[PDB]
C-alpha cells in the first residue's frame, strides 16, 4: 500500500470542466516521489485557451504523494486506499464569486497513478477575478487540515486558498473536501493533522499551448490540543 510509493511513480491527470457554460479539457502528466514529498506535473489545455486562471485549478489537479514521516504514517489515509483508490470531492467557493464542484477518482492502473476529474462551475461573474483572468500567476503556501470521517470510512479536509489579485489584494477560495475509498480496504482513519503544502507555478518556454508547470512539496505534521506541531 505504502509500498507502492517507495520510488518514482508516473502520474496522469485528466479534467473535463464546465464553468458558466465555458467547457474545456486539460491533460496532465508528471511524476511523484513520496519519499521526498515531491510532485512535478505539466498541464495542457487541449481545447484551446483555458477560460479560468491556471492557479484556480491547482488544488483540483494527488495527496497520496505527501511525505508522512515515521510518527505520522499511522495517519496516511491516502496511501492506505491504494491501489484500489479513493474518490475526492470538493466544493471550492470563491468569495464574492462562483463556486467549483469537483469529483475525482485517484487510483493506480498498474504502475501509473491516475487522477481523473469532472468539474462544474456556476454563478461566476463574467468580469470578476476568475472569468476575467485577474489573478497573478503564483501560489501561496498553506496548511491542509485533515480529520477522520468514521461513518464514511474516509476523511474530510478544510482550508482556504489566498489567490493574489493583479493590482489588488486577495481572492479567497474556500475549500471543503471529502475522500472515500473506492474498494473495501482496509484503510487508515487518521487523528487530526495537517499537510504543509508548498507550490511553484512555472512555464515551459518552448510550449505553444496554454499550459502550467507545477512543482510541489508536501509534508504531513501533527496537531496537539489544537496547536499545529512545527518542524
Amino acid at each position, epitope marked *: 500500500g505504502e509500498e507502492l510509493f517507495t520510488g518514482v511513480v508516473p502520474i496522469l491527470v485528466e479534467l473535463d470542466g464546465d464553468v458558466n457554460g465555458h467547457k474545456f479539457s486539460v491533460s496532465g502528466e508528471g511524476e511523484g516521489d513520496a519519499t521526498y514529498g515531491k510532485l512535478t506535473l505539466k498541464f495542457i489545455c487541449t481545447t484551446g485557451k483555458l477560460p479560468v486562471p491556471w492557479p484556480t485549478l491547482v488544488t483540483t489537479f494527488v495527496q497520496c504523494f505527501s511525505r508522512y514521516p515515521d510518527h505520522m504514517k499511522r495517519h496516511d489515509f491516502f496511501k492506505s486506499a*491504494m*491501489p*484500489e*483508490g479513493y474518490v475526492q470531492e470538493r466544493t471550492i467557493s470563491f468569495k464574492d464569486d462562483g463556486n467549483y464542484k469537483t469529483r475525482a477518482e485517484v*487510483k493506480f*492502473e*498498474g504502475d*501509473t497513478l491516475v487522477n*481523473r476529474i469532472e468539474l462544474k462551475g456556476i454563478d461566476f461573474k463574467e468580469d470578476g477575478n476568475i472569468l476575467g483572468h485577474k489573478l497573478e500567476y503564483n501560489y501561496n503556501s498553506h496548511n491542509v487540515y485533515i480529520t477522520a470521517d468514521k461513518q464514511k470510512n474516509g476523511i474530510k479536509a478544510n482550508f482556504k486558498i489566498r489567490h493574489n489579485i493583479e493590482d489588488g489584494s486577495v481572492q479567497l477560495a474556500d475549500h471543503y473536501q471529502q475522500n472515500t475509498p*473506492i474498494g473495501d480496504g482496509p484503510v487508515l482513519l487518521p487523528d487530526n493533522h495537517y499537510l504543509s503544502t508548498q507550490s511553484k507555478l512555472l512555464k515551459d518556454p518552448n510550449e505553444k499551448r496554454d499550459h502550467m508547470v507545477l512543482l510541489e512539496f508536501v509534508t504531513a505534521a501533527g496537531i496537539t490540543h489544537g496547536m499545529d506541531e512545527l518542524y
Partner: nanobody
Framework: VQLVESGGRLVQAGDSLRLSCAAS????????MAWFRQAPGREREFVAA????????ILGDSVKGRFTISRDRAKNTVDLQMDNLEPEDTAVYYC????????????????????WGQGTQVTVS
C-alpha cells in the same frame, strides 16, 4: 454499468473473428476491461485485459500471438480480435469491467472485476 458483447458466430478453423463489447451507463470510473471465456465442460479462462487510460494489454497463455485486445474510450467499447481460430477456442466469450484501481497482476483473475456481460457464443469448426 451495462456490458453488451457481440460478434459471435460459427467460423471455420483458421478464420478470423472480431468481438466487441459496449459499456453503457456511468462509465466514467472504468479502470480496465477484460475478456474471459468458458467452453461448456471446462472452467472459465482469462483471455485478455486492457488498462483503460494508457491501454496496456495482457493476454492469456492460450491465445498469445493470435488474439489482440483494444479499446475506444470515446465509444466505451473493447474489442477482441481473434486470428487463427481453433476448435479449442469454442466457448462463450464474456466481457468484464473493473472500476477499482489495481496492480497489473490481479487483472488475470476472474474475481477481479466489478461488472460482467452476458456473453457471445463463438463456435470454431
Amino acid at each position: 454499468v451495462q456490458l453488451v458483447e457481440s460478434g459471435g458466430r460459427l467460423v471455420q478453423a483458421g478464420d478470423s473473428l472480431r468481438l466487441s463489447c459496449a459499456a453503457s451507463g456511468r462509465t466514467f470510473s472504468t479502470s480496465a476491461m477484460a475478456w474471459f471465456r468458458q467452453a461448456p465442460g471446462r472452467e472459465r479462462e482469462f483471455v485478455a485485459a486492457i488498462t483503460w487510460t494508457v491501454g496496456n494489454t495482457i493476454l492469456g497463455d492460450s491465445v498469445k500471438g493470435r488474439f489482440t485486445i483494444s479499446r475506444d474510450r470515446a465509444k466505451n467499447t473493447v474489442d477482441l480480435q481473434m486470428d487463427n481460430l481453433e476448435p479449442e477456442d469454442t466457448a462463450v466469450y464474456y466481457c468484464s469491467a473493473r472500476s477499482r484501481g489495481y496492480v497489473l497482476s490481479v487483472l488475470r483473475s476472474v474475481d477481479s472485476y466489478d461488472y460482467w456481460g452476458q456473453g457471445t457464443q463463438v463456435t470454431v469448426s
